């Protein structure tokens, strides 16, 4: 159910007394377990707030971007996020340059589309070496461009596992005043983000839960069947 105690089961644990003071603002007093921890009440109230806000944002046919770059877990997670619902996503380290300047990347994306049409047309015009070089530049285009390959309107809201991990994306979002959500920690930056979700990301057990919650936030707006926040039971997740 919505923000019910069953969902919040493991969201604690972080760097050892590496805490940015500007987030005692939204973090409980110092924990006694030799690691930085998180509480869940401010958590689920802020989760309801962001839930409804981004939901009614997406009701207005908004432009939404996704990103995830950590080693393997969040990558496959955001791959799932992209695969159920068609939406802008980023799977690798985004090199930047959409909000600060998208007209330049417009040529890159247009050439991507033209060349995809080319393989849709070409049968045997290129030899084995030419074909492999062509497929390799297709892969070069895909691994950095294939998640944002279906838009000319810049997204106005995006998720992130850590603003510090993606300071490039944070700064690019700061070019405009678009809203943004973040899986926040005690070492992050509060003033350079718009929506804060202070939760554990060192342990993937919390990361998967929070990403599924934001996934349901962006899912019910598209009328696609939801996963959690409405399922009374819970499904066990573990990295493997």
């Amino acid at each position: 159910s919505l923000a019910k105690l069953g969902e919040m089961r493991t969201h604690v644990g972080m760097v050892k007394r590496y805490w940015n003071p500007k987030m005692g603002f939204f973090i409980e007093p110092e924990r006694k377990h030799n690691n930085d921890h998180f509480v869940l009440e401010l958590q689920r109230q802020s989760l309801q707030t962001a839930y409804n806000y981004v939901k009614e944002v997406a009701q207005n046919n908004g432009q939404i971007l996704f990103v995830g770059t950590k080693n393997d877990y969040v990558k496959k997670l955001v791959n799932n996020i992209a695969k159920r619902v068609d939406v802008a996503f980023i799977t690798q380290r985004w090199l930047g340059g959409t909000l600060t300047n998208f007209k330049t990347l417009s040529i890159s994306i247009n050439k991507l589309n033209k060349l995809v049409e080319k393989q849709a047309e070409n049968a045997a015009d290129l030899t084995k070496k030419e074909n492999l070089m062509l497929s390799r530049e297709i892969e070069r285009l895909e691994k950095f461009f294939g998640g944002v390959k279906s838009l000319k309107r810049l997204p106005n809201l995006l998720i992130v596992d850590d603003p510090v991990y993606e300071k490039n994306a944070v700064a690019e979002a700061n070019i405009l005043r678009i809203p943004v959500v973040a899986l926040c920690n005690t070492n992050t930056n509060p003033e350079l983000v718009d929506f804060i979700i202070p939760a554990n990301n060192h342990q993937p057990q919390s990361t998967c839960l929070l990403m599924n919650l934001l996934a349901d936030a962006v899912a019910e707006a598209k009328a696609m069947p939801t996963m959690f926040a409405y399922k009374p039971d819970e499904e066990i997740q573990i990295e493997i």
Binding site: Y53, E56, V57, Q59, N60, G62, N156, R177, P179, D194
Partner: peptide, 5 residues
Amino acid sequence: MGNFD
């Protein structure tokens, strides 16, 4: 930043 609509 109140909602878009």
